[PDB]
Each structure stands twice: as C-alpha cells, then as structure tokens.
Symmetry: C5
Subunit: 242 residues, 5 copies
C-alpha cells in the first residue's frame, strides 16, 4: 500500500496507527509513496483539490511554499540522496501537505532524515506534535546537506597546485551547482513558511528562525566553496605559466 | 480563413463552438485570431477596443508582460516554443491576449501546440469549464511545452564527454538557452503581475494560478542551472586542452 | 531671439504654428529650442525658471532622468540614437525638457529624427492633439529610433560565422551596445519615475505611458540578449581556434 | 562550573569581578564561558534557556546572525580574525552571545584578542561601564582587529610589482579575503538586525551602534576593493606574460 | 599655519564675513573649516559638547562616505574628493568629514580640497554662498565637479586605446584608477541620498538643487561603470589580436 507510516499526534506521545486508514484526521501524520497508483484517489476522496494533488504529485518540482485554503498549505523540500549506488547531488524531493490539521508527506527517493524520525517515533522519543515534526523534517534535511557539504570541503582542502592528482575541482563544481539549484529555493521556501504565520510556526517561532538561519548558512557555504573552486582554477592557470 | 481562427462560447457550463463570422464580442466567449490578418484591427476597433491598445496588441515587437486596462480589462503577452516546420523551437512565438468586456481574445502569428491541445480538448467536450480555467490552461500549456523543449537540451548536456569531441555541442546549447531566457524571465514577471492585479480570472482560481507561477519560476531556475552546466563543460574542455 | 527653433500652440486639438519671438511662456504651448544658444538662459530666467534648474538643463554632462520640480513642473531628460550624417549613432543625443507653467520647453543640440518627424506631422495637420500626447510621442519616437538601430545590430549578429573572418565584427557590436546601455538603462527609470509622479500629462494617458515603459524595458532586455550573443560568439571563436 | 571563564557585575559603573561558580544568572552581570565544556548546557537549561536556543548557541556550525528571542532576550553571533599563535588569521573564531533575563552570556572556543583586551581593562578598573557599553566594545573590538589584519593585506597588495615575481603574493591574499568575506558580510547584517530590534542595549547608545555598523560596512567595501585589486594584478600578469 | 582652525565664516547675514580663527564657542550659522589631524581639535569639539563617540568617529583613521543623523537637527556627513596634492595620486581620494551641530557647519580635512579652496576664494571676493544650506550644496557639487574633471583624464586615456599600438596600452593603469574611485564614489551616492531623505533644513530649503547634486553623483557612478566596461572590452581586443596573429 501507498501509506508507509501513520502516526497520531493527538497527545505528546505519538501512537502508531493503521496503514489502511481511509480518512485524513486532524493531528495525524501520513507518510506516503508519491508514485503509488492508489495515492491520487485517496487524496481526492479526502477532498484535496485536483489541482493541488496535481502539483503535489507532479514529475517536476522546486522547493517552495504555497498557502492554500484556511490554514492549509503545501511545502516542498529537497534532500541529499544517500541511497546506495545513487548520485548524492541527484537530490530527493519531499512534498508535504498540511490539510485539515493533518500532515501528509510524500516521497519517492527515500530520505535518511525521515528514516531517523520514523525510528525515533518507533522508540517513543519522536516529535511531540505536528509543529515539532515539521521542524524536525526541515532540520533533518539541513543536517544531511551539511554532512554532504563536509565531503566537498574535504576535496577542496586537498587541492594542491603542485599535485595534479588533487585536481578534482571540476567534480566539486558540478556537485555544488547541482545542489545550489535547489538549496537556494529551499531558503525562500522556509522564509515563506515563517512569514505565513502558520499555527505550526507561531507555536515554535524561535526554532523555525534557527532552521532558517541554518539554510541561509548552507547557501553562504556553497557560495564560498564555489569561490574556492574558482580560486583553484586560477591557481592552476598561474602554475602553468610561472 | 478570415482573421478568426476559432470561437468558443463559455456562457454554458459545457463550452460550445460558434461561428468564426461572429462580428460582435460577447462576455464569456473566447475568440482565437490571426494577429497579422488585415481585418483584425477593424474588428477590434468596431467592438470599441481603443486604437492605442490595439496598436500595442498588434505591434511588431513585444515582450511578455501584463497590462491592466480599464475596469476588469487587461492585456497579457506571453511567449511559447516554436514547433513549426521552418523555424527553430527557440525562436519563441508571441501570444497576445486581451481580456476585454468579459471576453478573452487571443492572437497568434504562428500556431501554438499548447493552444492546439486546448482546442482539441474542447472539441472532445473535456476542455476548460470557464475563461478563468482557459487562461490558466494557456499559461500552463506554454510552460509544459517549454519543459518538453528543455528536456531536449538536458539530453545534449548529459552527453557532454570531454574525451569525445563529437559531443561538444555546448555552444549550440548556450545559444538556445539564452534565446529562451530572453523571454522566459519576463514571462515569470508577467504571471506574477497578473496574480497581483487581483483579476477576477485569478481570484476564481487563486491556488492554480500560484502553481502556474511556481512552474515558470522552476523553468527559469532550470535554465540557470543548464547555463551553469554549459560553463562548467567549457572549463573542463579548456583544462583538458592544457593537459592534452 | 535665435534660440527658438519652432513654437506650437496646443490650446486647440489642431495645433497652430506661432512666432519664434515669444517673450512670455504660455500654457499649452510647445517651445523647441537650441540648448547652446547664448540667449536661451536669459529667456528661461526671465520667465522665472530658477537659475539652478537652468544650470542643470543646460549642463555639459547629463543622464536620462526625471526631476519633479515644484507646482506641477518637472524636468525630463532623455537620449536618442544619433542619426545625423557622418555621426556615430552611439554618440547619443540628449533632449532636455521642462514642463513649466503648463508649457513644454524642449532643448536640443544634436538634432533628433523623432522630433523632426513630429514637426513634419504638425506641419501636415496630423501631429499630436495635446501637450500630453506630444510628450508621449517624443518618448515613443525616441524608443522607435533606438529599435531601428538595434535591428542593424541584430543583422550584424545574425551574420556571425565562425568559419568566415570577414564576419568577426563582435568587438564593434559590443562597443556599440555598451555605449547605448550606458544611457538606455537610466532611460527606463526616467520613464518609470515620470509615471510615478502622477503628472497631469501622464494621468490623462495611463495605459499609453505604461506601453512606452514596456517598450523601453524591452529595449533593455534586447540589449542584454545581444551582449550575451556577442559574448557567446567570442567563446565560439576561442573554441574553434583551439580545436582547429 | 569549570565552563565559566570570567564573571563581572555591571550593576554599578565600576564593574566588579565575581565568583566563577555562580549557579543562577543575575541581571546586569556578564558571564563569559567555554562553549565546548560539557557543563554549559546544564547551567543554561537550569537557568531556563530553552533547549532549542541552547542547541543553536552550542552548534558545531554557525554564521554571524541576530535572533530576537522572548521578552527583551536575543542571541547574537559574531566572527573575529584568529590572532592565536601559529593560527591562520582567516580561520575565524565565532563568539556566540545571549542576552538573557538582563544578563550577557558570551561563549567562546577560539580565544578573542578583543575580548582579552576588554577583560584586561576590567581587571585594570578601566573597562566598559555597563552591559550596553560592553556589547558595543565587543562588536567594535572584533571590527578593530579585522581592520588591523586588513592593513597587513593592504601592505602586501601595495608591494605588488608585475616585474618582480617575488611580490606575487596576491593569490595568498585572495584566499584570505574570500574566507573573511564569507562571514564579514553576514556580520554587517547581524549588526543591522541588532540595531533594528530596538533592544534596550542599543537604544541607550544609538549613535555609537550606528558608527559600529558604518565600520563593518566599510570593512565589507574595503574587502571588495582588495579583491578588485587582486583581480587587476592577475590580468596584469597575464598581459605581461603573453607579450613574450 | 600653527592652529587647528583654517578658516571661520559667519553666515548670519547673506554677505558672509570672515571671523577669528581663535578656538572659541561655536555659533549657529557659522562655518568652521579645520585640520582633522591637529592635536587641539578633539579638545575644542568636546569643550563644545560634541559627544565623545561622535568625535571618535569624526576623527577616526579609517572612514567611508556616509550620512549619520544625530540628536535634534544634528548630523555627520562624510565625503571623498580627488587628491590634487603632490606625492599623492588623484585616486587616493581625500576624506572631508562634516558635522552639522547646534546650527553650525564644522568641516575637517587632512589635505586640501580644490573644491573647498574655490569656495573660500569666492567668500574672500564677497561672491560666495549666502547660507549654510548653500555652502554645503556647493561643497557637494564642488567635489562632484572635480571628480568629473579627473574622469575626463581617464576618458582621454580610453579614447586613445589602439589595439595595434602597444604604446597605448594604459588600460591596467586606468582600471586601477577606476576601481580606486568606485570604492568611495558608490557610497558617496548613498550618503547624498541619505542626506536628502533626512529632511534636514539644509536640504528642504534647496530641495531641487540637492536633487541635481544627487543626479550628478549618480551620473558619475554610471560613467565609471561604463569606463570599466570599455577597459574590459579593450582587454578582449588585445587577447583576440594576440592569438589571431
Ligand atoms: Cl523539489
Ligand atoms: Cl524524489
Ligand atoms: Cl522517506
Ligand atoms: Cl535526508
Ligand atoms: Cl531568505
Ligand atoms: Cl512577447
Ligand atoms: Cl509570433
Ligand atoms: Cl495558436
Ligand atoms: Cl506552445
Ligand atoms: Cl516573480
Ligand atoms: Cl542625457
Ligand atoms: Cl545632444
Ligand atoms: Cl531636435
Ligand atoms: Cl530620435
Ligand atoms: Cl523600471
Ligand atoms: Cl559564526
Ligand atoms: Cl570559535
Ligand atoms: Cl575569548
Ligand atoms: Cl578578536
Ligand atoms: Cl546593512
Ligand atoms: Cl571617507
Ligand atoms: Cl583623508
Ligand atoms: Cl580644504
Ligand atoms: Cl576637490
Ligand atoms: Cl541613490
């Protein structure tokens, strides 16, 4: 079935619920397979408008925040692809709907950050509410981007002009532009979410601001790394003349 | 053909096809027209469209843009991929649309596949159910065709191999990308402005027009990424030449 | 007083040509003048144009700009293509205009083709019907000549052929485009600012001024595209030379 | 309790040194702490600093930033050049500051020469006379040290001579400059955001904080200029090597 | 020769009068032109109750063009001009730091500005500004005027670029000059904007004149960007010419 997980956040101790749930209920989280044949009917049966279902399930996407009817919204985010035999910069997309007090998330390429949240819920130490769950999805994705950026930084710190074996600047640059494509929009999506004054944000104002600070830092770090690559390229030009 | 290509009536929930010899503009009708036909100005002016707005609508040169006019009226100009036999897809066609006294009037020089697909949907009685939806579909249809074309560019970039000279189609790619960008950036701003006007067409379908705007933004960011990829390959070639 | 080139009375919709020895400035009149004539300062100051505003109007150096002055008065400065025989077209002319006590006073040094066409139309009883329309026609006339010149640049660009050194005119085209960009970018903000001022000369024709603003924006976008084309052809030459 | 480096009381304008084992935070006190010490979290949390705030204060990665918190509370994060023995200057230190319940709590890992100088002043009974002044001195202190370091880069850049290959220290200068730029830009915004919050610590010294902000703005512009000079020298070298 | 105060003028009346250069109490409608590096200036400013930190900023080693609204109607305005003194380059621009304080204009210099000399000469001939509002306007426009004159010398260099004549290749020198100018002239534009938006009595009495001065500095900035664009193109000209032939 399309429903990977279902949790009830009616109390601070989330309880696991049937993956055969027919109706969307307030305070519940549904984590779903985006490409499964049955998800469209389930969403539409539950009165999610056709056009918003279409955007949520579309092949193409960018990180973005979309205010919808009365407290509802869509939030789309990207994460690093940590799956085996995958290109990490071929970033996964998580598409989230906050609809009638429920959080519905959709995935295709599995997210390590989301697996950690799921594992925490199973061990009875997960988020205490939907507001906190969304916060942890945002920060978990940030965290995994930071880890990937550390591997780029290692490659960059290896750049030695007198050593041609360390000339990996083209690969790093390719990785960095691929990430920048989505991580820049990610920053604006989190900004827009906050400015929306969603009950999920206004209950955790300082925490969402910290999340926004981290995504901003990530973007500034990418810019710096791109500058380092450019500098190394000129250092190679300068070494070829001496 | 006179100037009028096709005429649809949305004053019933199921749109009906009407005569192309309609002489008067009626609310909730869509008139699809040849911009370069000699008779179009006369028809527009006779139906009380001001001469100066007709002049902008029929101008040789244009850019995608939104123009609020009197009352609920507006002009919206957009570009699309050129899928016609003697042209290049990147020499994008201009579609100039007037929303006037409750009617939609679209004008073309060269046919648009987006608009053709809408006309086929209406003929099969499964097209847009209103002018609001119709304009929404025109915008999203143009996006979709731009996406399709961009996929073709992506394939070219994906075959870039520095070790293989025959794959060095990076200059062609860049030419195409910058030709698209020329118009697709103002397209984003036109759609933003349309939304911000609070047009009755938009406010009936607010989330859907927001989604269309998200898609044009994505397209622009995709073009920027591809232009980055092209610049990267050009460095990869240059840095290979000094070793090679 | 030899500084006055031509004087028109727009008090009626059929403008009449008047004497060039006009002491007092009258509302709804247009005075077209030689900026560098020794008698022009004295005429302006005697008609109560403040000295510092005469200083700016007549200054040696200028940029396209809009200046709200007091009491419905303003100064507008614009640039045009130099179409004079044996001139360099990118040696652009500057037209400096005062809207002052309900009169339009324009000043020239390098003659403008757009203004000559307006004067010719007036001589034939088909010129603008008001000062509001006249100013709009000066702006759009200048836009139009810029478009014409840009078309010649485009021709040059379409003839780029990497395998034909007789076509390697990219340095000259780049030179022309940056020289025009210098003034054409401020021109767009000048027109934006004119519209924002809510001048009676603009509020009478809101849609028309937004079209003029759209044309100047287009020109700027076209210039950026052409520069991108030049930059690409430079890269093309560098790739071709290193590959052959 | 070994996390606390120093503790001062600013209740009076003569600040007094207090015990390094103060379990409860008091208004008008300054606590300067080791960020990496395992006991800091517990002390902050026992004093009712929310866990997520502590999480951000103590995180591995940071950028300069201002965070408005509850009820006059805030977090400010700033960077400083690294003046520790044998360190890279551009391996910049991060100072993370909480203003919480009327107390200033600063946290360090890499020691700040600026903060050491403020501490020496307090030990010599000539330090800042309030928490408002202390925060101002921390900001301006960090700035001052950056200015001093940048003067060394300026010397290096002025000694550059294209005919003397021993003066080619511009790429090392460039490495330093981009690394500093990375954080110095966010620093300017953090200080702007601090001022815009209308914090009691700022509104008591409004002109002083404006001057501090002008200084960081100047630092940014100077770095941009030095980066421009470096680029210029590189082109100078390219142009000097390709003449042979 | 020996003192901090260079000149003192009284603009109480439309015909300014030269007054004593003795370190006294400042008066509304007076202009005090001073040596910024003289040991005595800080004491005078503080004796006259200018706050310590404002004095620190005014007399600081480093500066950028900027506008600083202070208490009441007071402000600080910092500007840069061409350095037309010997053993300096024109592009090593001088900082002129100006305080409007209790209705007096206090300007400070390190090295002479030709713009301010010309105003001082006009005052001496009884043909100078008739008010502090006009004085400050003339300082701003005077500084613009001299930057324009220098930019003309750069234009001369540029117009003489000829790709087939290596003796004309002074584009490295020109670009260095331009980025050095741009460093300060960009902030100067914003400082003048900021001064205008403050609604200072010195600005509101001459609203169109100060806008013309703002238009002039904006024009200067655009001209600089254009010349920088011409230097980049001449670099492309050379590069093409070199490996084509
Ligand atoms: Cl996405
Ligand atoms: Cl995915
Ligand atoms: Cl997942
Ligand atoms: Cl993840
Ligand atoms: Cl943001
Ligand atoms: Cl168009
Ligand atoms: Cl077309
Ligand atoms: Cl069509
Ligand atoms: Cl299409
Ligand atoms: Cl937009
Ligand atoms: Cl001009
Ligand atoms: Cl002229
Ligand atoms: Cl003329
Ligand atoms: Cl013309
Ligand atoms: Cl604009
Ligand atoms: Cl930091
Ligand atoms: Cl640190
Ligand atoms: Cl420290
Ligand atoms: Cl420090
Ligand atoms: Cl700022
Ligand atoms: Cl300065
Ligand atoms: Cl100085
Ligand atoms: Cl002086
Ligand atoms: Cl000067
Ligand atoms: Cl400005």
């Amino acid at each position: 079935g399309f429903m990977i997980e279902h949790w009830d956040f009616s109390t601070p101790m989330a309880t696991q619920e049937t993956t055969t749930a027919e109706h969307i209920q307030p305070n519940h989280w549904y984590h779903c397979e985006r490409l499964h044949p049955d998800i469209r009917g389930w969403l539409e049966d539950n009165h999610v408008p056709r056009a918003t279902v279409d955007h949520l399930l579309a092949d193409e996407s960018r990180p973005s925040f979309h205010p919808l009817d009365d407290d509802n919204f869509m939030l789309i985010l990207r994460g690093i692809n940590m799956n085996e035999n995958a290109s990490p910069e071929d970033m996964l997309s998580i598409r989230i709907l906050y609809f009638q007090g429920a959080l519905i998330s959709t995935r295709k390429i599995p997210s390590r950050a989301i697996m950690e949240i799921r594992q925490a819920l199973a061990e009875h130490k997960g988020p205490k509410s939907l507001a906190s769950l969304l916060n942890q999805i945002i920060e978990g994705l940030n965290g995994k981007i930071d880890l990937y950026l550390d591997t780029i930084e290692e490659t960059l710190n290896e750049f030695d002009v007198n050593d041609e074996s360390t000339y990996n600047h083209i690969a790093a640059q390719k990785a960095l532009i691929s990430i920048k494509r989505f991580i820049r929009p990610q920053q604006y999506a989190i900004r827009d979410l906050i400015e929306s004054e969603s009950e999920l944000v206004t209950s955790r104002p300082h925490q969402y601001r910290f999340a926004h600070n981290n995504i901003t830092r990530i973007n500034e770090t990418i810019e710096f790394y791109l500058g380092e690559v450019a500098l190394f390229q000129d250092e190679i030009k300068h070494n070829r003349d001496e």
